[PDB]
Ligand binder design. Sequence first.
Ligand SMILES: CN(Cc1cnc2nc(N)nc(N)c2n1)c1ccc(C(=O)N[C@@H](CCC(=O)O)C(=O)O)cc1
Ligand SMILES: CN(Cc1cnc2nc(N)nc(N)c2n1)c1ccc(C(=O)N[C@@H](CCC(=O)O)C(=O)O)cc1
Ligand SMILES: [Ca+2]
Ligand SMILES: [Cl-]
Ligand SMILES: [Cl-]
Lengths: 159, 159
Amino acid sequence: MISLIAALAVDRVIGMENAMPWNLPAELAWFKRNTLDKPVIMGRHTWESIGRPLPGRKNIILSSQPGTDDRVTWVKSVDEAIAACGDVPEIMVIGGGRVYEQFLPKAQKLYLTHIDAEVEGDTHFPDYEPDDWESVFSEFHDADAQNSHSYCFEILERR
Amino acid sequence: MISLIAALAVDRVIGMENAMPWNLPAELAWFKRNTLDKPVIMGRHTWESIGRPLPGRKNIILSSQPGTDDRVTWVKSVDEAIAACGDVPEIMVIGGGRVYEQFLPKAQKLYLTHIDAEVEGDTHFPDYEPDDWESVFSEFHDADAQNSHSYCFEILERR
Ligand SMILES: CN(Cc1cnc2nc(N)nc(N)c2n1)c1ccc(C(=O)N[C@@H](CCC(=O)O)C(=O)O)cc1
Ligand SMILES: CN(Cc1cnc2nc(N)nc(N)c2n1)c1ccc(C(=O)N[C@@H](CCC(=O)O)C(=O)O)cc1
Ligand SMILES: [Ca+2]
Ligand SMILES: [Cl-]
Ligand SMILES: [Cl-]
C-alpha cells in the first residue's frame, strides 16, 4: 500500500522558500521511526533539502531531470517509482507538494504531524476530505527544552 | 580571558526554557568551531536543551540544585566555575540569561549571532554599551534551503 508522511503547519503549509522555522527533533524521530526499512519516494527539491540519502531506507527520487547522485535511484514517473519499490508491504511518500498530489489518490494512510506554527507558505499539503479518512491515532505534545513548537502526531486510514 | 557566545533574535531576545523557533545548522557550526577544545560554562536550562555533554569541551554547569549527571562538572558559584576551568587562554560562557548577566562584567569578548527572527520573549541578552566594545568582525548570511533565517556573526572586544 502507499502512505504519505508529512509535517504540516497551520493551513496545511509544508514548505517555504527557505528551511522551515522550527527545531523539532521529536518530530524527526517520529519520521525516522515510521520510514525506517521502507522505500521512500521524494521529489528533487526535498532531496536537495535533506542533503544526503536517508540511512537504512531505499531512497527513490522522482524527477524529470537527470540523476546527480549514484547513491539513490532516479525515476521519471509515478509508475516507475512504484516498480522500483519491489514487493514491500508499504511505500512511504515523503514530499513535496507536487509529489503528494500525484500519490494522494492511491494512498491508503496518512502519517501527519500538525505543528502549531503560523507561516506564509510556498507549498501546501493537498486538501483532503476529512469524511474520507479515519483518525486511528493521535498524540499531542507541547514545545519543550528541545522542541520549539507544540505538535500532534496523527495517523489516518482511508475509509 | 572570558568570552560570552550567544544567538540573539530581534531586540536581543534569547531562549528561556523552550527551544528557539529557528533551524540554523550553519549557526551551530559556528558555535562548535568557536567552543571546541575550550571549557564551556552554562546554566541548567541550557544544559537540558543540549541534552548531553558537548564533545571535545569541558562542560561546567552553574546551578544551585544538584548534579544529576557525572559526565560534567556541577558548580554552585561563579568563582567555582572559573576555578574549574584551570588555566586556559579562553573560557566560553554559553548561557542562559542569568549566566550571561553574571559573567558580562568579567568578559573581554563577545561572539554574537544576530538572527532576523521576531520571537516573543521575557529574556534578553544583557544590555552592552557597544562604546565599551569595539565591533571587530561582522559577516552576514542569507537564509537558504537548510537555514531558516538570515543571520549575522559579530565579534566585539572590550575597550
Ligand atoms: C528536510 N527534510 C524533509 C522532511 C522533514 N520532516 C518531515 N517530517 C514529517 N513528518 N514528514 C516528512 N515528509 C518530513 N520531511 C528532512 C531533513 C532531515 C531529515 C533527517 O535528518 N532525518 C533523520 C532523523 C533525524 C537525525 O538523524 O538528525 C532520519 O534518519 O530520518 C529528514 C527529513
Ligand atoms: C541549545 N543549545 C544552546 C545554544 C545553541 N546555539 C548557540 N549559538 C550560539 N551562537 N551561542 C550559544 N551560546 C548557543 N547555545 C545547543 C544545542 C545543541 C548544540 C549542539 O549540538 N552542538 C554540536 C554541533 C551540532 C551537532 O553536531 O549536533 C557541537 O558540537 O557544538 C549546541 C548548543
Ligand atoms: Ca478514531
Ligand atoms: Cl520535492
Ligand atoms: Cl540556563
